[PDB]
């Protein structure tokens, strides 16, 4: 029963971690986009 519970929570935790990492990637890409649009706002 512990192995069953462990496998279920493993799957759930893995999917949650993937979603959280995607959120962080989007946030950092937003920061990079801020920097890039600021440089464009300066140099074009």
């Amino acid at each position: 029963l512990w192995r069953e519970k462990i496998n279920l929570l493993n799957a759930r935790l893995a999917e949650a971690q993937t979603s959280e990492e995607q959120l962080q990637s989007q946030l950092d890409l937003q920061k990079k986009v801020v920097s890039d649009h600021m440089q464009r706002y300066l140099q074009v």
Binding site: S35, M38, Q39, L42
Partner: peptide, 10 residues
């Protein structure tokens, strides 16, 4: 590093 570039860097 003009003031605008300094604002961007900061």
């Amino acid at each position: 590093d003009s003031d605008a570039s300094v604002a961007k860097a900061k």
